[PDB]
Every structure is written in structure tokens, then in C-alpha cells.
Amino acid sequence: APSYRVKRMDIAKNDEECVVNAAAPRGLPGDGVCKAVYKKWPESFKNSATPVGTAKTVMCGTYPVIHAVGPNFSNYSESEGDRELAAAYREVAKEVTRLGVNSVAIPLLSTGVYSGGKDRLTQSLNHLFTAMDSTDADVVIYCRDKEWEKKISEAIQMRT
Ligand SMILES: [Cl-]
Numbered sequence: 001a002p003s004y005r006v007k008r009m010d011i012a013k014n015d016e017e018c019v020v021n022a023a024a025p026r027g028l029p030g031d032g033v034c035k036a037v038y039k040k041w042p043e044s045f046k047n048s049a050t051p052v053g054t055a056k057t058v059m060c061g062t063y064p065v066i067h068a069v070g071p072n073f074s075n076y077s078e079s080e081g082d083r084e085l086a087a088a089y090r091e092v093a094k095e096v097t098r099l100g101v102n103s104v105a106i107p108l109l110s111t112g113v114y115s116g117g118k119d120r121l122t123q124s125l126n127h128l129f130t131a132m133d134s135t136d137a138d139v140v141i142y143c144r145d146k147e148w149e150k151k152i153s154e155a156i157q158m159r160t
Contacts, residue, residue: 009144016101023068055069109124
């Protein structure tokens with residue numbers, strides 16, 4: 001039966017059938033997760049640019065990289081940024097479905113450098129759940145912060 005799990009490690013080392021990149025705008029290599037995805041799957045950046053609020057899949061070999069561009073809350077208002085963040089996750093769920101994968105590795109979009117200086121764990125994770133609950137895939141959420149790992153794990157446990 002489909003599950004959610006959380007792991008505190010580099011998503012570029014995931015054990016799932018595809019990966020969601022927390023993509024920088026304009027198809028650029030970015031930083032953090034996006035830069036790690038660029039180092040591991042550089043071929044997946046060929047024509048990967050896609051607008052804020054959308055996702056675009058590019059294959060590296062046969063391994064799918066779903067580039068999802070969340071809003072940068074330093075540029076967006078809270079209300080418009082929230083809408084684009086929800087929309088990016090909804091496009092991820094559509095791509096996961098279209099690909100037919102059994103599992104997907106996902107980071108929390110619009111956190112950290114794109115968070116506008118605010119902790120958005122709950123906001124981003126709730127949009128992740130809303131989108132991915134519509135799919136049949138095992139979801140493995142990747143984070144790096146120890147307290148975030150606890151809170152995500154707590155949230156996963158209470159939906160079981
Ligand atoms: Cl984190």
C-alpha cells in the first residue's frame with residue numbers, strides 16, 4: 001500500500017524510481033538541492049527551464065527528473081506565492097502519474113533560499129500531501145535539517 005517516508009540525506013542519493021528537483025528558475029544550476037541534482041543528473045537540464053508554478057520532466061538516461069519550480073517568496077506576495085506553490089506540487093503529481101512510477105523522491109519546495117526568510121515546512125508539506133495524496137506512488141521526502149526530519153515524521157505518522 002502507498003506510503004510516505006522521510007529521510008534526512010541528500011536527494012541525489014535517493015533510492016526511488018524518479019526524483020523531483022527543487023528547480024531554480026530559468027533552468028539554471030541553482031544552489032542546494034538544485035545544484036546537487038545538476039551535479040548528479042546534468043543531462044536532465046537540457047531545456048529544463050519551466051515557469052514558476054509548473055513542473056517539467058527531462059530524462060537522464062531513462063531516469064526521470066521532474067523539475068518543479070516553486071515561487072521565491074522574496075518576489076511573490078504571500079497569497080500569490082501560496083497559489084504558485086500549490087500549483088507546482090499539483091504539476092508534480094500529474095507528472096508522477098503520467099510516468100507510471102511506483103515511487104518518487106521529493107524535496108520540500110520553496111523552503112530555504114526561496115522561503116523569503118520564513119519557516120515554510122508546514123505550508124510546503126501540506127501542499128505536498130494535498131497533491132501526492134491523489135497518486136498511488138510511494139513518496140519519500142528528503143530533508144537535511146534534524147528538527148525538520150522530526151516534524152515531517154510526526155506529520156506522516158498522524159495520517160496513518
Ligand atoms: Cl531541511
